[PDB]
């Protein structure tokens, strides 16, 4: 099985800043077959990204992805409080499909 | 030499239309008829062999029927990409021959 | 003897661990005149991670089929039987009864 | 508007049985592969089972072999999960999801990722 | 139309990761009158260790074949085409181009 | 993949000669029959010739007998069409295609213009 | 009712011998003939169907030929286990019938 | 595996009746035709009757018409042979076999002895 | 892969005694598909046992085997000095076939 | 009398190539699957490659992918091992072995164990 490890566990940034989330794989992920989901508190997950870099429909351009093999990133620009959610990566290049344990994103005030 | 006659020479239709082209050989063949689609400037693409068999990768909207001296090509729901020229060809005897064609606009 | 005769995917080829390609085989004197035949893409099998594995092998599944054939020649026909590659399976040297 | 509506969740004793249903609307259900993904309380997402368009192919996570069964009724636009011999570890929020697909060169390309999620249904396995 | 017609293992079924059994299919009015058809032994595939795995599936490889059939009836015949299960392959939900 | 690349097409005067080539790749060239099909500007398709794998059998459309010669060099994965005593009617895009009866694999074509100026 | 005649009624051979049994129907059938091997006290075992096709699990030493009114069963290299009674049967028309048999000793 | 088990064979006087059973397992009984073939002591094989999956078609050897009745109970995976007005010539081991034309699966047989004593 | 571990590494016994050699597997071995080989110094290996308990041709009855799943034994009775050799177990129930690292058997004099 | 006779072994520099042959006599070679098993000096036995009766099936240990090739010439009653891009770790005694087989229900049952061994041929990969 491909084990996906996400970083940081919890990320705290201010509105307007840029969040970078990592997804690392135990073996190379085939054909960049890596997706990202957003799960806001009390809601079901929503697909954000597919194929490492393509945006799902209705997803704004401030959400972006890149990566290949064993390392992938999800970038969220112009962070808004509504972005408070757990973000999961999921590969679909090896059977069974697997998920990372998630990155908890939280918005804070800057001193 | 087996002469192949197509009908109509040309035709006009819209997306979703049920189009039917007819090939008629000079002498009765068995199933030895093939159908082709030619977009302008490109090489023909084979649609049907053995009068009724769909080729590898051809959409199911294309269908073929016929025996002996009457043969038809059908496009159940015409698509924007189906606007081309269609040719029938016989492989019953040498020299192999094609019909005059049918333009779809 | 002579007999009178009247006349009438889930894409496994890509999702299989022993994937295959189709190769065209044409004879204008045979019915079917076109037969697409399977050829295994690899010597080994694709494992669950998508990598080639040589602890197993892709092997083709052959089948004996009936075909009509013009004799010698388009009016009279002969019923013939040929070997055709239909797809591939993944085997190992071990027999599991 | 596309929607997946799960039902069937509840509180069961270990060894108990449960059946989850998920009703699909707004799309051609028979065109999609469907899965069950679970999330243990306060924990991550884990794949449970997959089923193709006509149910001729069923896939399962190892932890549920001999216990869970994925099924579908394309006429009832429903996906099911028969859960037998339930264990405390099966305690999670169960989501039904539909798999993305493309039609390229007029071949159906299934992709094992989820473009639509239900709201989820809670399954609590506890003796006390 | 009517045409006159004249007339004429490496045991993968056990070594395959998607093994199969043969089931007899008889029709005294069909030529071939007997067709042995494949049925997959499992829902999943046998992994390298010999265990059933549900990360993959055994699926049958079907093929369209020509058969002769008595009409209605043993003197005149009809050429017909039927779907036949030849063997099994192992697939996963993933498309590897 | 199967690729067929024609070349040789030129502007030639009536009575002249031209040799067309068709370079194949993606298959065992020596295992298949090859064909030549032509198409006059604004006109339909016309089958010209075909050739057996070992080149031991050749077939021609009546209008090209004597003049045209189909040949192959399996070593060089190439099909040839030697066109002698060229007539105005020979003006066409010539295509090479693989096999005999039903033609699935075609090249992009090579243009032959027979005109006096 | 199609009568099936076998020849010889009985025979003697040794291990390695090339044995040939002959079935002759009253009226010409096509390929609708089957061949069976019966060891004493046991149910028959099917060897051949369609006059010439070997059944699943039957050794290649067994072969069948024939058409119309002449049909043969051949055992290329007779084995110690091939000592049995062999019957031909027709499936051309009702009632289905068997030949009188051939004992191999 | 496919198993066919005949029972019912007994010693019966001429003019008597006997009903044979054949219990099937290892296959979907309702999907196949079933047959009865008999063999008189020291004599050859004789086809008796067959029956369609749904029992809508039955076929008999002339010598048994009127007397014998083939029947099946798909629920009970069983084939039957009701043998009335038994004659001495009916003495045989009766076998049930699956299918029509070529019989691959047979039972071990059941003995029927028609004799007066 | 099925990893086979043999015990003891080295075994020293006197003539006439009985030697017991163990072969343990990391996962259950299918259908008792476990073989034993004898490799005398300077020679190629010779098959001793197949199917856990069956003796190969020419192998005397003082060599015996038993076992199933993850534990198998080879017994050598009436030990003779000629028995000085490395004994290997090998499974052929899972792909690839694998061997144990061997048991070195040596014959000694009794005090 | 049955025999397997290896040849081809020697001393090579890392990166070197070598070809081992093994000649079979006393049996019908074309009836057997054949393997190459190796033994590093003073170490255990390790499987390298397998080949079926007609060479339509070739199996390999992962450490030799893209480097070794197993082949056979059934007319020459010989088995071969083309060893390219040799490494210090390939230093071993290479044995060719024949696989046991049964004929049960008139089906060929191959068994992945070795009823006959050659004497072996030493392959030393060293730069100094």
mmCIF file of C-alpha atoms in Angstrom, chain B residues 36 89-91 93-98, chain F residues 33-39 44-51 58-65 68 70 94-95 97 99-103 106:
data_model
loop_
_atom_site.group_PDB
_atom_site.id
_atom_site.type_symbol
_atom_site.label_atom_id
_atom_site.label_comp_id
_atom_site.label_asym_id
_atom_site.label_seq_id
_atom_site.Cartn_x
_atom_site.Cartn_y
_atom_site.Cartn_z
ATOM 1 C CA UNK B 36 -15.196 4.991 -44.801
ATOM 2 C CA UNK B 89 -15.783 0.097 -51.113
ATOM 3 C CA UNK B 90 -16.051 -3.572 -52.241
ATOM 4 C CA UNK B 91 -13.483 -6.324 -51.582
ATOM 5 C CA UNK B 93 -13.056 -8.954 -56.645
ATOM 6 C CA UNK B 94 -10.125 -7.162 -58.283
ATOM 7 C CA UNK B 95 -9.954 -4.278 -59.070
ATOM 8 C CA UNK B 96 -11.243 -3.112 -55.689
ATOM 9 C CA UNK B 97 -13.611 -0.120 -56.241
ATOM 10 C CA UNK B 98 -15.238 2.721 -54.229
ATOM 11 C CA UNK F 33 0.149 -6.537 -47.733
ATOM 12 C CA UNK F 34 0.441 -2.878 -48.720
ATOM 13 C CA UNK F 35 -1.831 -0.807 -50.992
ATOM 14 C CA UNK F 36 -1.894 2.509 -52.975
ATOM 15 C CA UNK F 37 -5.217 4.449 -53.165
ATOM 16 C CA UNK F 38 -5.391 7.824 -54.987
ATOM 17 C CA UNK F 39 -7.770 10.789 -54.959
ATOM 18 C CA UNK F 44 -13.472 10.453 -54.946
ATOM 19 C CA UNK F 45 -11.164 7.589 -53.912
ATOM 20 C CA UNK F 46 -9.678 5.180 -56.528
ATOM 21 C CA UNK F 47 -7.756 1.956 -55.569
ATOM 22 C CA UNK F 48 -4.520 1.747 -57.640
ATOM 23 C CA UNK F 49 -2.468 -1.318 -56.609
ATOM 24 C CA UNK F 50 -1.534 -3.744 -53.799
ATOM 25 C CA UNK F 51 1.478 -6.077 -53.113
ATOM 26 C CA UNK F 58 0.850 -7.554 -57.382
ATOM 27 C CA UNK F 59 -2.604 -6.264 -58.460
ATOM 28 C CA UNK F 60 -3.391 -3.153 -60.525
ATOM 29 C CA UNK F 61 -6.346 -0.934 -61.553
ATOM 30 C CA UNK F 62 -6.658 -1.306 -65.386
ATOM 31 C CA UNK F 63 -5.865 2.391 -66.108
ATOM 32 C CA UNK F 64 -2.310 2.019 -64.578
ATOM 33 C CA UNK F 65 -1.188 -1.396 -66.140
ATOM 34 C CA UNK F 68 2.823 1.877 -62.830
ATOM 35 C CA UNK F 70 4.288 -1.504 -57.157
ATOM 36 C CA UNK F 94 -1.617 9.164 -53.489
ATOM 37 C CA UNK F 95 -2.050 7.369 -50.170
ATOM 38 C CA UNK F 97 -2.510 1.997 -46.691
ATOM 39 C CA UNK F 99 -3.667 -4.634 -45.931
ATOM 40 C CA UNK F 100 -6.008 -5.551 -48.843
ATOM 41 C CA UNK F 101 -9.797 -5.535 -48.405
ATOM 42 C CA UNK F 102 -10.631 -2.980 -45.692
ATOM 43 C CA UNK F 103 -7.989 -0.291 -45.137
ATOM 44 C CA UNK F 106 -3.376 5.117 -44.068
#
